[PDB]
Design a protein around this ligand. Structure first.
Ligand SMILES: CCCCC/C=C\C/C=C\CCCCCCCC(=O)O[C@H](COC(=O)CCCCCCCCCCCCCCC)COP(=O)([O-])OCC[N+](C)(C)C
Ligand SMILES: CCCCC/C=C\C/C=C\CCCCCCCC(=O)O[C@H](COC(=O)CCCCCCCCCCCCCCC)COP(=O)([O-])OCC[N+](C)(C)C
Ligand SMILES: CCCCC/C=C\C/C=C\CCCCCCCC(=O)O[C@H](COC(=O)CCCCCCCCCCCCCCC)COP(=O)([O-])OCC[N+](C)(C)C
Ligand SMILES: CCCCC/C=C\C/C=C\CCCCCCCC(=O)O[C@H](COC(=O)CCCCCCCCCCCCCCC)COP(=O)([O-])OCC[N+](C)(C)C
Ligand SMILES: CCCCCCCCCCCC(=O)OC[C@H](COP(=O)([O-])O)OC(=O)CCCCCCCCCCC
Ligand SMILES: CCCCCCCCCCCC(=O)OC[C@H](COP(=O)([O-])O)OC(=O)CCCCCCCCCCC
Ligand SMILES: CCCCCCCCCCCC(=O)OC[C@H](COP(=O)([O-])O)OC(=O)CCCCCCCCCCC
Ligand SMILES: Nc1nc2c(ncn2[C@@H]2O[C@@H]3COP(=O)(O)O[C@H]3[C@H]2O)c(=O)[nH]1
Ligand SMILES: Nc1nc2c(ncn2[C@@H]2O[C@@H]3COP(=O)(O)O[C@H]3[C@H]2O)c(=O)[nH]1
Lengths: 520, 147, 295
């Protein structure tokens, strides 16, 4: 199967628009998050691979009555009068922390294999030419060599941390785990993964707050590693700002100095500094003053940016209710200033209660000013399919009439007891019933002739031009909404555009209009 | 749905909005007070200087009796300083108190930034008509001063 | 005027804005450092625990030498904590120090609230296009979640938005449309689409005034793959010139292809030109169909 794998990888070419490639970008995002967190943590907190040095506390012995420099216990790292000295191991801890180091180098090799498969997919990456991906190997390899992505992938895969990033006991090399910031250079695949994840998500604001919580945790973790690197570079326990025994917030009474204590106090210090609460010990030396001043101003600027984005994100979770209540505050302030009647005030308030309870606000502005009219007409014929399947001017005629008219229909919500049409008024519109029930009544409002249900067409007698009766532009009947009624309103101009283009719908409309006008 | 229908039907909508967000603030500080005192009594009261007890000395100073009212009053004050990130409370000692205070301070940063941003928008929209009016008149006055 | 002309001419305007406001912050904290140390040496150094000196113990702790660098470093740190209102500095003692700290903390509240509000707006407008894009897509997605739209059409809309963000073909001509003059708009639009409009036979076999007239009335519309731009039953109000993409003139079965349409091809004009010689008139005479994504 070696020739199967060899020839399959020989003319393999990746489509970047697939879902499987998006899952691969999520895998590269996981590898990048690994590189970020654990490379700065393994550089600063160097006991994460094994301590590689023996801690030596001074201990007043109870038998020999003298101080000895024995190895520290957890009871001797508690309540310290001085920080322990670290005698170097002869094998640099490789005889007893080899399981931790092989687990770390296994995950390093795993994410480097993820980077190798990612740069192979970059080497065979299809690209849009005329709206279609090119998917034969020669053109995509030459487009890869023309684009300097080989430079970006080749800087990002230098294995300098496999020779210089580990404790070598022979040359007494301490190790430099900071040499995987070249693996941190590949940020663009992660940014495209987060953009494609925010595009495809059904819960976008939840994804946004998860991403900014991850940003906050990564920033506080990196500042924790900077604080502990500056603390161990100055020297631990040398003053009251640096981590150590003189700090007394870092190591209080009955608190053991462990690696967990170091990371936990550094994360807490960075949480108080970056959020500028500042309930941490004051700096002593001038370099600590410079670092705390720079780090507090970085905390002010970038955490003001971050929580402003957080406040905007949890503000836009209720933007529709905020716009709705801004409109209703405008209507209510206009009605309070103008001394409008209380019956009409509660009619407007109950109309707004129906529009929020049934969610029938004008939401077609979004598709109207973003989407193309071929996608708008397909969405509008998708949503109102059960309503427009009942319409006799649409289902007894050509589909081009419905495709023309489905974007010119406007949804208008009427209160119960509202007169949509009455005989004295002039008519510029027709109405198709989306929801609701109506009644054709007399001028007394008691006698009902015919009811109108969902899918009924009315209001066309005024805007169709029949010279056979006395009315003309007048409404010929009194329709009245029984309950709340949504209606597909259509102008006289848009109807007569689609009727001048489509003649058979014009013949059916004028035929049934003259038929109801001549029995009426 | 009751709060939405009450904000719909109200003749004083911004007063109802600030009453609802003051109730939200009081419920959140009360729930964090109960979380702080549950973690204090789970760790054990008076075992260190962060937990409520005799070693705290902000919770129980001199000539202050340990009562149930004192427990709720100190827990409500601690949550008021932590969620608003003033932070004039004793520092954590054990690692679980550091983890709880770090998580609770970041929850305070995020959700109280959201809350007071909503409060500032609510008491900004009490004068939106005067603000739009004076933005228009500032435009007219700057055009007349330039020309 | 130098800072305004530098922000005008810059290719990186937001980086220049954050450099200018970092310089403003450093100048303000430096001037307040000089005010704090002038009031400290006017009251007299080391006279109480608020003034710089030996009684302060934040200014001069144990094993810390009193130097000029120490004076400027502690004054800059004091002004950084006061103007950002962290306030982890010693409390005032005398009434003049209370008055100075109250006035300086309120100046810090007001002018640093102004400053970091400007900073938050500046690093918010570094991603204003992505924010407007995702506000539009949140509107479309909430409308499709409320209205029970089909999943095929939902992923068609989502893939259309993925193509508009990946290829950056959003409607960016609104900026030049409502800011720039039409002589500069037509020169930019004939600069950008020169390789496309050099392939157009109604523009290159005729006068240049026609292209100069029509180049601002052209609108860029992006179509999905498999979309029918024209088919025979529909009426036509528009013509189409291919900016990008490939199309195919197909039959009603969608299998047999007559002629393909590449970049610079002109189609859709038979419906809107008025020829009385054939039976169609306002009807489309053929079925065109997008192969891939088509501008
Ligand atoms: C586990 C810690 C168990 C020992 C406790 C301890 O304490 O760990 C420390 C530090 O080792 C570590 O954390 C190594 C952690 C290695 C983690 C490996 C995971 C790699 C994968 C990363 C995740 C990526 C996911 C994707 C060992 O130091 P020690 O016990 O030998 O010194 C104490 C000796 N006295 C008592 C005499 C003083
Ligand atoms: C997280 C691991 C939590 C383990 C808690 C139990 C350990 C324990 O309990 O063992 C600790 C020993 O610490 C250890 O070496 C265990 C190793 C823990 C390593 C912590 C450093 C992690 C840094 C990695 C970067 C993380 C980035 C993510 C972004 C936030 C003893 O605990 P103690 O101090 O109470 O000993 C009182 C006697
Ligand atoms: C509120 C009740 C205020 C009563 C004040 C007089 C009591 C007094 O005065 O009696 C207290 C005794 O406390 C008590 O057991 C009275 C019970 C108070 C319960 C407080 C806990 C309430 C928790 C309920 C949750 C509330 C949620 C609402 C959201 C904020 C003595 O007062 P002392 O400490 O000065 O005794 C010095 C000798
Ligand atoms: C900045 C210069 C940094 C030099 C650091 C090494 C000096 C050193 O290291 O020499 C210092 C001596 O101070 C000095 O007179 C050097 C003069 C430094 C002047 C600092 C005041 C500058 C004010 C100018 C305004 C700046 C406005 C810009 C806006 C921020 C000794 O240092 P030490 O305190 O550790 O002596 C322990 C024994
Ligand atoms: C502005 C204030 C700058 C003052 C910094 C300064 O005085 O330098 C002191 C440090 C001391 O180094 P160490 O004791 O941390 O090893 O020496 C350094 O090497 C720090 C220089 C880096 C800046
Ligand atoms: C991140 C920092 C995590 C460190 C937490 C830890 O060390 O666990 C200690 C607690 C102690 O329990 P107790 O003394 O409060 O009863 O033990 C626990 O049970 C707490 C674990 C819950 C997390
Ligand atoms: C409001 C609070 C005002 C109180 C200020 C006051 O009492 O004046 C005291 C200062 C003392 O001067 P000096 O000791 O700093 O040389 O005398 C002054 O000269 C300060 C006056 C400037 C204001
Ligand atoms: N006059 C009349 N109108 C009816 C009848 N049934 C439905 N209608 C509709 O009621 C509508 C009222 O407004 P129009 O006169 O424009 O058009 C009328 C018809 O569309 C009927 O039986 N008689
Ligand atoms: N009928 C027909 N139309 C073509 C042909 N080649 C290109 N077209 C274009 O396809 C278009 C479809 O819409 P129109 O009828 O408006 O205009 C048509 C022509 O512009 C062809 O060979 N036959």
């Amino acid at each position: 199967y070696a020739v199967r794998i060899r020839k399959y990888l020989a003319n393999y070419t990746q489509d970047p628009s697939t879902d499987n490639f998006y899952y691969w970008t999520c895998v590269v995002t996981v590898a990048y998050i690994y590189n970020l967190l654990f490379v700065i943590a393994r550089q600063v907190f160097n006991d994460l691979i094994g301590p590689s040095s023996q801690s030596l506390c001074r201990f007043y012995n109870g038998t020999l009555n003298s101080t000895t420099q024995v190895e520290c216990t957890y009871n001797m790292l508690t309540n310290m009068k001085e920080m322990p000295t670290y005698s170097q191991y002869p094998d640099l801890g490789w005889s007893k922390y080899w399981h931790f180091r092989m687990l770390w180098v296994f995950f390093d090799l795993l994410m480097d294999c993820v980077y190798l498969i990612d740069t192979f997919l970059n080497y065979r990456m299809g690209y849009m030419d005329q709206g279609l991906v090119v998917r034969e190997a020669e053109k995509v390899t030459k487009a890869y060599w023309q684009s300097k992505q080989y430079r970006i992938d080749g800087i990002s895969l230098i294995p300098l941390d496999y020779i210089l990033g580990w404790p070598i006991p022979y040359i007494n090399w301490r190790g430099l785990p900071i040499l995987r910031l070249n693996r941190l250079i590949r940020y663009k695949r992660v940014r495209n993964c987060l953009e494609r994840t925010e595009t495809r998500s059904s819960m976008p604001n939840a994804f946004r707050v998860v991403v900014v919580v991850w940003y906050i945790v990564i920033i506080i973790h990196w500042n924790a590693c900077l604080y502990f690197w500056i603390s161990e570079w100055i020297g631990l326990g040398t003053d009251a700002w640096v981590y150590g025994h003189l700090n007394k917030q870092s190591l209080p009474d009955d608190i053991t100095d462990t690696l967990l204590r170091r990371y936990v106090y550094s994360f807490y210090w960075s949480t108080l500094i970056l959020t500028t609460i500042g309930e941490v010990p004051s700096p002593v030396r001038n370099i600590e003053y410079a670092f705390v001043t720079l780090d507090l101003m970085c905390g002010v600027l970038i955490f003001a940016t971050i929580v402003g984005n957080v406040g905007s994100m949890i503000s836009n979770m209720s933007a529709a209710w905020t716009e709705f209540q801004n409109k209703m505050d405008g209507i209510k302030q206009y009605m309070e200033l103008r001394k409008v009647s209380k019956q009409l005030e509660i009619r407007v308030i109950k109309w707004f209660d129906y529009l929020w309870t049934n969610k029938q606000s004008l939401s077609d502005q979004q598709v109207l000013k973003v989407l193309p009219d071929k996608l708008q007409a397909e969405i509008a014929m998708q949503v109102h399919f059960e309503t427009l399947r009942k319409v006799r001017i649409f289902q007894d005629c050509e589909a081009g009439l419905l495709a023309e008219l489905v974007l010119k229909l406007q949804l208008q919500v009427f209160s119960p007891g509202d007169f949509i049409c009455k005989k004295g008024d002039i008519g510029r519109e027709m109405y198709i019933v989306k929801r609701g029930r109506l009644q054709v009544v007399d001028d007394d409002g008691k006698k009902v002739f015919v009811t109108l249900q969902e899918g009924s067409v009315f209001g066309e007698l005024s805007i169709l031009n029949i010279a056979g009766s006395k009315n003309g532009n007048r409404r010929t009947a009194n329709v009245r909404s029984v309950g709340y009624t949504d209606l597909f309103v259509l102008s006289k101009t848009d109807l007569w555009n689609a009727l001048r283009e489509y003649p058979d719908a014009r013949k059916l409309l004028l035929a049934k209009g003259r038929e109801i006008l001549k029995k009426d």
